């Protein structure tokens, strides 16, 4: 199906405790494949999926140079932004950056993105036309003008439509055995009394890749949000994901409830009922 | 000044993209690559000149100011006034120097034409 | 757009100063002057590429977007990833990559020396 490659950057100032923290991670789909942590020993881009370890020393030298250029400009950014908002030196602030590309089932470019946050909220973002900027406020507007002067949007479009898609494809081939696999969910169901006259049905889905999944409860063939508790999808730690959905049912009416599981690893969606 | 330094850094990479974006990498593009290596050298050299003139001056550098004065002056005379520049050649290189100065003056006139045509077509 | 043209004009003359200000004119600098004539061609060609890419109602021109995509992609491989794309060409490429690495170190040394307050 469709694929994406995404890089996530976090930059935290630590006033009175030294250098700002810098962390970079890269993903293909829901699989991390690289990391950089300014606090680690290596001071290098590091592998986090086994199909990237094959890349030679030149590649790793190259990604380390580029991430270091990211780290150092983000450090300047923290001061610049402090000045834009007239903030004291004593407070810690956070800069976040996310960029990457999507490709369709035919591996062709679909969309690219580049987003920049300050203190947890949108600062400036590249629009889907890969030409213009969304500037959240008057500080972002100053950044927008500098970024227009320097043709930042054109650099990003050139990367997003070329390098980003070229190297996404390459990772998808080299990591074909895992990245292009689908692990269907292993499903089951639990039951507990929750009151005098009520019980909880919990519909489980374990060991699934990719992470995208739909779990819905139906009572008599109609979907309900009521009593429906859906936990956020969580990582198992081994490359797969977990999720559950719970519904509170009047004790004695369990057989009126069905859980529906939709996942791309499923030939057809599943129907589970308490037995 | 941190701001001046930041602006010089920023200008450096602004120009790097203008070099990179039109740098086709072919065989028989080896001369374009050699030209762009020299352009990157000029970008770096001019950044250094800016650091020396502005930013306190970090003392241990030759202030470009007097060179800016003489070079502006010789250029106004080569391109516009046609007043003679003295001691710029001998008999063995008089002709090469006169030829390239003429080529140069034509290029500067063409540059003005090119730029002001842009303002005529879209700026007014 | 009026403002786009004005910015492109302004960038042309801003760069012309940077070319003019360091060029000593005499017979010892004939090769410097010839290089600078090419740089002046380059400034003019790039201004034309900006007009083609950024201006709404413009005449027929070759849109540079696809060469920008391809050139970006090739340079990332030449300088950083080393993914493969005679002996003379591979030698300028090696010199080019060394120059780009030196460029980075030159720029971030300026930030290190004067742009940080800590």
């Amino acid at each position: 199906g469709s694929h994406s490659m995404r890089y996530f950057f976090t930059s935290v100032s630590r006033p009175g405790r030294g250098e700002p923290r810098f962390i970079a991670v890269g993903y293909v789909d829901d699989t991390q494949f690289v990391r950089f942590d300014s606090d680690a020993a290596s001071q290098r881009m590091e592998p986090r999926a086994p199909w990237i370890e094959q890349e030679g020393p030149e590649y790793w030298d190259g990604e380390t140079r580029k991430v270091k250029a990211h780290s150092q400009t983000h450090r300047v950014d923290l001061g610049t932004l402090r000045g834009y908002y007239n903030q004291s030196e004593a407070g810690s602030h956070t800069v976040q950056r996310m960029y990457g590309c999507d490709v369709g089932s035919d591996w062709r470019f679909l969309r690219g993105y580049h987003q920049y946050a300050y203190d947890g909220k949108d600062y400036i973002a590249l629009k889907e036309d890969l030409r213009s900027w969304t500037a959240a406020d008057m500080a972002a507007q100053t950044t927008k003008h500098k970024w227009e002067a320097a043709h930042v949007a054109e650099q990003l479009r050139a990367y997003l439509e070329g390098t980003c898609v070229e190297w996404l494809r390459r990772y998808l081939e080299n990591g074909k055995e895992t990245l292009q696999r689908t692990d269907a969910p292993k499903t089951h169901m639990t039951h507990h009394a929750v009151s005098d006259h009520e019980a909880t049905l919990r519909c489980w889905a374990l060991s699934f890749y990719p992470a995208e999944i739909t779990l819905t409860w139906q009572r008599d063939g109609e979907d309900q949000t009521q009593d429906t508790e859906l936990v956020e999808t969580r990582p198992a730690g081994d490359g797969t994901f977990q999720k559950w959905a719970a519904v509170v049912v009047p004790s004695g009416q369990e057989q009126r409830y069905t859980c529906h599981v939709q996942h791309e690893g499923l030939p057809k969606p599943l129907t589970l009922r308490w037995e | 000044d941190k701001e001046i330094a930041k602006e010089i850094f920023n200008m450096m990479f602004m120009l790097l993209w203008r070099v990179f974006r039109s740098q086709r990498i072919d065989a028989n593009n080896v001369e374009l690559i050699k030209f762009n290596i020299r352009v990157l050298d000029w970008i770096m050299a001019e950044a250094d000149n800016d650091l020396c003139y502005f930013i306190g001056t970090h003392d241990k550098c030759e202030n470009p100011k007097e060179q800016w004065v003489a070079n502006y002056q010789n250029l106004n005379n080569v391109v516009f006034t046609n007043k003679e520049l003295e001691d710029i050649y001998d008999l063995s290189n008089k002709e090469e120097t006169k030829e390239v100065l003429k080529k140069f003056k034509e290029k500067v006139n063409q540059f003005y034409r090119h730029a002001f045509d842009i303002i005529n077509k879209y700026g007014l | 757009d009026k403002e786009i043209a004005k910015e492109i004009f302004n960038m042309m003359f801003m760069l012309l100063w940077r070319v003019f200000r360091s060029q000593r004119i005499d017979a010892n600098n004939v090769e410097l002057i010839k290089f600078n004539i090419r740089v002046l061609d380059w400034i003019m060609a790039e201004a034309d590429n900006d007009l083609c890419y950024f201006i709404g109602t413009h005449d027929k021109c070759e849109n540079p977007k696809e060469q920008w995509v391809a050139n970006y992609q090739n340079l990332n491989n030449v300088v950083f990833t080393n993914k493969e794309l005679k002996e003379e060409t591979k030698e300028v490429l090696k010199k080019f990559k060394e120059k780009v690495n030196q460029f980075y170190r030159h720029a971030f040394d300026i930030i290190n020396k004067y742009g940080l307050e800590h």
Partner: peptide
């Protein structure tokens, strides 16, 4: 593969 460089805000 990372972007080759980023620009100051």
């Amino acid at each position: 593969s990372l972007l080759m460089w980023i620009t100051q805000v």
